[PDB]
Swiss-Prot record, chains D, E:
Function: Forms an icosahedral capsid of pseudo T=3 symmetry with capsid proteins VP2 and VP3. The capsid is 300 Angstroms in diameter, composed of 60 copies of each capsid protein and enclosing the viral positive strand RNA genome. Capsid protein VP1 mainly forms the vertices of the capsid. Capsid protein VP1 interacts with host cell receptor PVR to provide virion attachment to target host cells.
Coiled-coil residue spans: none
Signal peptide residue numbers: none
Protein's cellular compartments: Virion; Host cytoplasm
Name of the protein: Capsid protein VP1
Assembly notes: Interacts with capsid protein VP0, and capsid protein VP3 to form heterotrimeric protomers. Interacts with human PVR. Five protomers subsequently associate to form pentamers which serve as building blocks for the capsid. Interacts with capsid protein VP2, capsid protein VP3 and capsid protein VP4 following cleavage of capsid protein VP0.
Species: Poliovirus type 3 (strains P3/Leon/37 and P3/Leon 12A[1]B)
Curated annotation (Swiss-Prot), chain G:
Function: Forms an icosahedral capsid of pseudo T=3 symmetry with capsid proteins VP2 and VP3. The capsid is 300 Angstroms in diameter, composed of 60 copies of each capsid protein and enclosing the viral positive strand RNA genome.
Subunit structure: Interacts with capsid protein VP1 and capsid protein VP3 in the mature capsid.
Lineage, broadest ranks: Viruses, Riboviria, Orthornavirae, Pisuviricota, Pisoniviricetes
Superkingdom to which the source organism belongs: Viruses
Compartment annotation: Virion; Host cytoplasm
Full-sequence portion shown in this chain: 75 to 340 of 2206
Protein name: Capsid protein VP2
Amino acid sequence: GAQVSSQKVGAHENSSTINYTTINYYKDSASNAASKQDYSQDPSKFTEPLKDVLIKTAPALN
Amino acid sequence: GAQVSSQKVGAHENSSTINYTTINYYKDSASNAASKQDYSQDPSKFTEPLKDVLIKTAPALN
Amino acid sequence: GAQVSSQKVGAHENSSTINYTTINYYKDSASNAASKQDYSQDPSKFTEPLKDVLIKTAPALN
Amino acid sequence: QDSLPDTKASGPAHSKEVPALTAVETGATNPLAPSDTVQTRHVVQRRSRSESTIESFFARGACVAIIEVDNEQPTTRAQKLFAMWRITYKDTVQLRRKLEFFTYSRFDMEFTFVVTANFTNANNGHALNQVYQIMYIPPGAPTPKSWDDYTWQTSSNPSIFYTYGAAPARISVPYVGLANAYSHFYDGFAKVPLKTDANDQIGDSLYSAMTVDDFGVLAVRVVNDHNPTKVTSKVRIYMKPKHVRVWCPRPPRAVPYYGPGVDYRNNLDPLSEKGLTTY
Amino acid sequence: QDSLPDTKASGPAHSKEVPALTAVETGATNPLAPSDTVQTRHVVQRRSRSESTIESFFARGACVAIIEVDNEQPTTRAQKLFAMWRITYKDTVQLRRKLEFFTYSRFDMEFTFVVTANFTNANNGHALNQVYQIMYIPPGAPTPKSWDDYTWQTSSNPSIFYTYGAAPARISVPYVGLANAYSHFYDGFAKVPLKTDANDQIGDSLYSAMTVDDFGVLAVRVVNDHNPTKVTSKVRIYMKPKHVRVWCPRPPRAVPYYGPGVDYRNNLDPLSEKGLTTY
Amino acid sequence: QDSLPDTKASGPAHSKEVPALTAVETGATNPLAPSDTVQTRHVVQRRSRSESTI
Amino acid sequence: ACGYSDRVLQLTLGNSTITTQEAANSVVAYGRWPEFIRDDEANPVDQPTEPDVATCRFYTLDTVMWGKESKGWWWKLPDALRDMGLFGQNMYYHYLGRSGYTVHVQCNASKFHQGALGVFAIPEYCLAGDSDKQRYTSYANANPGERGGKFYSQFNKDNAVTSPKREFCPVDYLLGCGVLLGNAFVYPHQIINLRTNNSATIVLPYVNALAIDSMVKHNNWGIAILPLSPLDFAQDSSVEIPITVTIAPMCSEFNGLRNVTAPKFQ
Amino acid sequence: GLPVLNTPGSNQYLTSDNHQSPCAIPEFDVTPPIDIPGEVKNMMELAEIDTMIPLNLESTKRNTMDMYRVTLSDSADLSQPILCLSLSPAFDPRLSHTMLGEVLNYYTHWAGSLKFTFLFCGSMMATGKILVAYAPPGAQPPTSRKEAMLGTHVIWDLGLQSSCTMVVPWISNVTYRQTTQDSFTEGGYISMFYQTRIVVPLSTPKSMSMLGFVSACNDFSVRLLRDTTHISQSA
Amino acid sequence: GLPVLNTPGSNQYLTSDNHQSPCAIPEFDVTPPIDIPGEVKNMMELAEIDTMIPLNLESTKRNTMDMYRVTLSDSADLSQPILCLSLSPAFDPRLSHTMLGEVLNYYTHWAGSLKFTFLFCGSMMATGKILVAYAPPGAQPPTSRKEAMLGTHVIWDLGLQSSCTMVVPWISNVTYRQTTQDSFTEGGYISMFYQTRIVVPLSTPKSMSMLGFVSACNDFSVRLLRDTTHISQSA
Amino acid sequence: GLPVLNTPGSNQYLTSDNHQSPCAIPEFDVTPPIDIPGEVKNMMELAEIDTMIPLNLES
Amino acid sequence: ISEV
Amino acid sequence: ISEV
Amino acid sequence: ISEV
Ligand SMILES: CCOC(=O)c1ccc(OCCCC2CCN(c3ccc(C)nn3)CC2)cc1
Ligand SMILES: CCOC(=O)c1ccc(OCCCC2CCN(c3ccc(C)nn3)CC2)cc1
Ligand SMILES: *C(=O)CCCCCCCCCCCCC
Ligand SMILES: *C(=O)CCCCCCCCCCCCC
Ligand SMILES: *C(=O)CCCCCCCCCCCCC
């Protein structure tokens, strides 16, 4: 059940891809650590909730 | 001897099937943890112990 | 070097063969735990050390 | 998957099929669902009965005993330099009531030991860390007469040596019953009085009781020799049934327990007053 | 990969396309980038928004409560031999303000317990190490009236037994809400006053409040019997939301909190004085 | 597997075979089982000598 | 097809037959029919005695009258049958015995009478007692035989310390054992409601923590009959109708034969 | 020596935990199971069994056998309710001690559909029609049949089938209600009325009992194991 | 017993850590999610939403609705700045409390391009041309349009499209600037001037408001989570 | 450093337990077995041997 | 290993 | 194992 | 490994 993922390596030693290993020890998912590999989304539903969405170089009002 | 099973994941992180690992360390089964994957059964032997079991839309007495 | 064996499961949970894992950490066998899977033998060398062993339904003396 | 059945879409009815009527005299509970008597929509059910499984209901360690033991200078009168407890779930009420929803049970048992101590008296110097010995004495074995007599040698009895301040001690016990299941209730006697008996004490027994010692005792002591000042300790015992199976359900206890049997004495009035036509 | 978009090389313009002009009345924010109004070079961007993800923003354990409990000789007046805390993130302001950037949330919760103690009085001898019991009492369960009454038996309630000096205690809790999400804000009542009501107290409720006990309480006590001298302890509770999801953003709290609701009372003047034409 | 031998179903006897009689002078213990002197039913034995091993 | 019904049954066991024209179907406790001990669940090694027809027939107990003040009746099994023909003889000649039962309760009245009997079969029916003294009910008192015992509306503590009755004090709304009667329905049961049915028929399997046990030391099943709704008729304030209990041992087998057990019931 | 680092939670004891531990009686020869009749796999199986309701908790009736008996009569006031009760299965005094009520007091949250079954224990010569109803929360609890008629209801006609069942369908705002009393998670109201009236002939009892029963429909579930207020012990 | 060696860090508690721990309510039946509208995946999404700037923090205007209103008029002194502000998005009193400013006060470092949008709230009969500008750090903060003209700027012409947007491009020496005030990581200066003037006809208001807005361009990011000075509590 | 969490039972001593431990005389040259007559594998073998009963425990 |  |  |  060992899960192996890659580290986003910031400062590199003078020595490529480095990994880390994870194993869940408990049956309940609430017991689990945070994976922190998170997906991002569009701001659109807040920044542009328009019914007719318009392209920025055209007149906003027409 | 590592046993790998799936978690019934309730609250999901913004990151699918998540697993947990189990290994028994001791020879005596009494030493073991509880698996908690338990099978359910019919209430029938208590709710309907009738010799002639009858379908709910028909008369109970006939 | 992981050794995997079966547990003689007495009280069973409401959930088959269950296993346990063993690994020896030390070079000297004296350091080891007890396996407790032990072979039994005949009482004969104590209960019947006779030169002419006789069948129980026949006369012991003849 | 373990989710409960979905609600089916159900519409109007005008028919000879009458689920709503029944006859409870039969001994049976009517298998009805909302769609049998009202119009229902389709609901995709996701709820489950995961936490009300027998294992889950019992999957908690409960306090069944508080053993008190002292460590002080051995004087010549009755002291508590060691103590003994008969193993049972009946000196406490909470786990007893849960276990008793059922007639017969079968399980492994997990014992966790919480040990706390304090100074009895205002001042006589102090105490170095204490090690406690918890010895199991199964029926038949020599019981201790003294806190440091030969029985504590424990050559064949299981013992736990616990160090104060360490994580609470924990051991596991197999299903150890003389029968195929533990009887939470026994409608009988261990002896029958016979017509030919000399006194009529010979055949007398306690009602509902089986063996005299049931499962033996736990003998507890402080292994340390006494400090100049006195230390009092309490060993709290938590019991957890695991890998559990239960048979023949029973109505829960409705009035306060009065001893190990089913006997009642007072507070026989469980139910509140409420008006027949009052919400 | 998670890096932000690269800057494109952009040159001079003389055209009918006017990104710079817009109309905010629409309800929309103008999607402009530096290359829309100035000449830009090509930059290969490597920066990322890894640390401002919802999980990362909340991925820190915050102090939400300080529970004080004493261990001393049981006298006959009000003491603190045990204490109870209603579980909430609202007795503190920092995590509350962070959680409230959003209307609804959904998460698992991590509880870490830091336990510290000291001697109250100059001198009466000393104390052997204390074990603390932290019991969760979900709404409905019997609450304790006494530091060592039967409720502490904890047969079905979850309890933590913590030993002083050991690493801070830590448990995890699932998403336990009655709804599909936790409401950080509830514009309503738990009761409606009806025209047919007898007194008009029947239908009265607190504004913004949902259930009376929300999520229950934590009952804390020292399991040790009292030393001759008094020990005072504080249990500090750190809360961390994990596996977090949040909905419907809200403006941050700009004035000091005044209780559990959105009510304000004073310091309603958040902003500094600064001249219109002053840098 | 380590369970002890099963009890065999055994019925009535009228014969020249006499397991019940013996001669302990020989130095030997008589190998008898319940089915040698009483009528027995068939029992599928599950008990074992696991805990009395050296 | 032809004309058959839920309400009309014939039960035949050994040389005995019961007819009922007003039944409410019939119950098989926990969905399990009586059966003999399987080889792989067997424990005593000696060949069993199975008396069959001589013991697995319907024995009818003494009749009890149900009147307006009747609080309830109880019986224990095998105890109610200790003196019943060759069944009782087999029970007392052997150390061990197992048996299932068909219980048939009989109570008819008229389309104008009124009342409902709760008939409950209870595994290990441990009853409560007389006293300050715990678990003190004497063997002879715990075992009324055919006669059965009764329920009371309230707890009268047998006060006489000096010369104790060592009797049960079964209170009706507490099912004689510290629990509420309304929940007794989790146990295998039927209701004899006089407008619906003459009788109740419950088939009991052998229930125990063991495959076989001592019948003289231990009762497996308890039969409790309580008036869920009181007897009433016309305007007559002193109505009385008979309740008759008929019971049959089933798949009976016995082990450990020796001289006969003669218990002391005085 | 494997380099390790001790995390928070170390050396604690959680009552609610699930870990392996040493066996104190190694190699013990365990008594095998036998097939005992009556095995239970889930506490919800018990809540699905019909048990009798203490419908009558009036001063002299409560903690007595009469608490189980509701009196119906041919001379009753037809405008009045036969019985009125709240849908609080673990809390309402009439429901809290039923087998369903008792299992629910070991849990914090309940969800699902319930069903009430009523038994006519009068003579065979007696007849009648009864309206039994359920009002979802939010309005004035019904005081007249006129009002009760408008909610979920069943019109029970007395006859050879002695009993009638009303299912109370799961109608809630929240996904799980609480087992304690609380206006925010309330279940609504149950009421009963005469639809016509009890009619008997002469030489027949004019008065009789009605017994009531409650059990869970198969969609019922519970969560958050907790201790019950239904038992305790003294110092 | 696996031979282990305890390392430094053992038995500590780091607030910032990420570890598994026992679940105190095992096997709990979790309420499933439903698709709620308005879900947020990253705090930077909020900083990209235009929110209104408190541009007017003068003595009687601040902590009032007038703090949001800049007065433009046909009789203004054309040589003077309409408004002058520093590019310190989390620190400058006009910017620090905007939604962008507020998210930045929970972080130590910011980087990326910003954009300011201005809304003309005068009558339709009003006209004008406005110069809005940004001066990167290092010189004298602009006091005249002559000086402001020379830096990054936009000449806004008032008309049917009511609003204008000036993007402040990421021009920095350091890869990440600080959220607090600091000369070493300073952002420069923003200024506004009349390019021509507000012109109205007769029967028209000669004076009117301009509302201002700020939000992050899509290249904006933040780092080093920290506590905000924007909230506190008493003893 | 592998992140670990100490469970209950930690640092206890159970008389009835079965664990490995360091060997205090490493690399010792052990005397080999020889086939001694009379080996016992189970205490029940002894209970199967006929032994004489003290049938007469009178004064 | 044994993956269920 | 499960390598992402 | 060595599975018996
Ligand atoms: C009616 C009374 O209670 C019970 O029926 C009931 C209660 C408890 C129970 O658990 C098993 C009891 C025997 C166990 C008790 C604990 N044991 C041990 C053994 C060794 C040590 C050190 N500590 N404890 C070994 C044997 C089994 C049944
Ligand atoms: C508005 C108030 O605060 C909240 O909305 C809010 C705050 C906290 C929260 O977390 C869940 C609260 C219930 C939890 C609290 C802690 N729990 C436990 C359980 C057992 C132990 C030993 N220790 N803690 C179990 C249940 C969920 C929501
Ligand atoms: C998947 O995990 C199979 C490989 C297992 C590798 C060894 C795991 C070592 C840790 C044991 C974890 C037991 C947790 C309860
Ligand atoms: C099956 O378990 C084979 C794989 C073993 C993986 C490593 C196990 C690590 C833990 C050692 C356990 C020793 C327990 C006595
Ligand atoms: C055989 O053992 C090969 C597999 C090894 C699995 C991991 C072992 C983990 C424990 C390390 C033991 C080191 C003992 C000195």
